Amino acid sequence: QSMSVKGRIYSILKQIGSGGSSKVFQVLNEKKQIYAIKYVNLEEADNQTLDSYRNEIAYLNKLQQHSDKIIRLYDYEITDQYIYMVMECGNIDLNSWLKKKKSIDPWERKSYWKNMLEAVHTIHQHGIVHSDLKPANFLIVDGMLKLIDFGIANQMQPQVGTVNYMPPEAIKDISPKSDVWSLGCILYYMTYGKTPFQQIINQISKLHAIIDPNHEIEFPDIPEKDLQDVLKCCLKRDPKQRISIPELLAHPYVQIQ
Ligand SMILES: COc1ccc(Nc2cc3[nH]c(-c4cn[nH]c4)cc3cn2)cc1OC
Numbered sequence: 001q002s003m004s005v006k007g008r009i010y011s012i013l014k015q016i017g018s019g020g021s022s023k024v025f026q027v028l029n030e031k032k033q034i035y036a037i038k039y040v041n042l043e044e045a046d047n048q049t050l051d052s053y054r055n056e057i058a059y060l061n062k063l064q065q066h067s068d069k070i071i072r073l074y075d076y077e078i079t080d081q082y083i084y085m086v087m088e089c090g091n092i093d094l095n096s097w098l099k100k101k102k103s104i105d106p107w108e109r110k111s112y113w114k115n116m117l118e119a120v121h122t123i124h125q126h127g128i129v130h131s132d133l134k135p136a137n138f139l140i141v142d143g144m145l146k147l148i149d150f151g152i153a154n155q156m157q158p159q160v161g162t163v164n165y166m167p168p169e170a171i172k173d174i175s176p177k178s179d180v181w182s183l184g185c186i187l188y189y190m191t192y193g194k195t196p197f198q199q200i201i202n203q204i205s206k207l208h209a210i211i212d213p214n215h216e217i218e219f220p221d222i223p224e225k226d227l228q229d230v231l232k233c234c235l236k237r238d239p240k241q242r243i244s245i246p247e248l249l250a251h252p253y254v255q256i257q
Helices: 047-062 094-100 106-124 168-172 177-192 203-211 225-234
Strands: 002-005 008-015 022-028 034-041 073-078 082-087 138-140 145-147
Touching: 002 073, 002 082, 008 034, 047 073, 047 082, 094 138, 094 177, 106 138, 106 145, 106 177, 106 225, 168 177, 168 203, 177 225
Parallel strands: none
Antiparallel strands: 002 008, 008 022, 022 034, 034 082, 073 082, 138 145
16 A cells, blocks of 8 residues: 655555544655654544644644654645644554563663653643643654653544543643653553552542542652652642652652762
8 A cells, every 4th residue: 555745655564553533554655764654634623623733733843853752753744634744653652562561670761751751841841731641642762762742632532531640630620740740650650560540440539539638649668769759759749749840850860870
């Protein structure tokens, strides 16, 4: 199978992702280089939806330059019927990698954490709060984590819908501190092998636990005290009492050794 994006021809290899009106394909260009093409169908898309897509593509294009922890967008073709986005191909998303890997190397975790902070820090510096960070939003590209989206474009039914990374303030109702909670949940999962409220099956009981101050989050003792402190700092229920990204970037866990 084959497709054209801005005059350039691409051979389709396999379908990566999907959605109600979107498909992601693994492709090859004329020079036999590997890419990901995100196809978006705009037939049933309303004006609100279109502007959400246009806004996200604009921010993805702009933030290319500011950090290599943001996915590469090489080119795109946008008409009234479709969007074709030629992007960087990743090895695997962080969620699939975490679900597959039994244990996680402490060096590998610290490395991924650094990348997650750099990517999220960059979007914040441009006025963007993601508000829905999960491990699925990150891509492993050459042992390096990259942020694939900014949470602007309207989400579609095909990890999606999950409340395990939701800050207490999002359940009550958004500031950059909201992303710190979600990042803290991802690190807690990479530390303890589960998210802080993963054991609570019932969604209502789970939402009640996240917002409950009397519901103490357990932080079992580990050889990395710096790591335990990060987790405790990210997971402060009060946004005003929570650590910021510039503060996490100066933290012993990210800087020592
Ligand atoms: C585990 O399956 C994979 C997951 C991700 C990628 N790589 C990938 C995924 C992507 N999703 C998007 C995307 C951006 N917004 N929505 C989807 C872009 C992109 C680039 N490479 C490759 C995989 O192996 C076949």
